[PDB]
Amino acid sequence: MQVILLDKVANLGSLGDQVNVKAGYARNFLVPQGKAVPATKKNIEFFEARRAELEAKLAEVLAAANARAEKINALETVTIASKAGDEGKLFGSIGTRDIADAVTAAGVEVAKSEVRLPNGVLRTTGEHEVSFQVHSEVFAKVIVNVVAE
């Protein structure tokens, strides 16, 4: 169908780009995910007025989502923000494994290719130490301090 995006920026289409799209991408990815809202010559008018608010006020702690996204598409340097990516560097214990929650791409992951650790990892500040496996049953490690602002 067609939508006006709600998305700040998206790899094609950005920042209240009203465009038509594939039906199979649009209804099951651009919506329902908040990255678009349907377009109609009714909707566009509503939306045009709305987006001076919505694609600004919502879209301002969302800068994080585009950045952190790389880190979870690879799962080499598994990095998400729990509160961060919009507050400076990714810091505190907060982030991935301290609640054992990190977003996956499709449940096929390299972020639980072994489990072994006694209280997880992360415990520095102003940077955040992830464990970056070197095997699948030994945890000799190569820990990094990546951020994804």
């Binding site: 169908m1 039906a23 209804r27 099951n28 329902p32 349907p38």
Partner: protein, 77 residues
């Protein structure tokens, strides 16, 4: 079944046909598939069996408008 629940479907009467123009009959199934629609207005999926003309139709009018009906068509939501 084999019905859209919207557009209104069921297989409907046919025949093989030949330039011979022989006599036999066969019906004809529409293109329906049960597709997992996202209600959003209770933010769940209420997977309905739907046509593929209809799939379009649902889209153009929007989720809770097909789902406005069903209730108004007196039938399983």
């Amino acid at each position: 079944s084999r019905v859209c629940q919207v557009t209104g479907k069921r297989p409907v009467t046919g025949n093989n046909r030949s330039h011979a123009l022989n006599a036999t009959k066969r019906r004809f199934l529409p293109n329906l598939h049960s597709h997992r629609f996202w209600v959003e207005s209770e933010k769940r999926f209420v997977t309905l069996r739907v046509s593929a003309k209809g799939m379009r139709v649902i889209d153009k009018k929007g989720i809770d408008t097909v789902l406005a009906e069903l209730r108004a068509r007196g039938e399983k939501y």
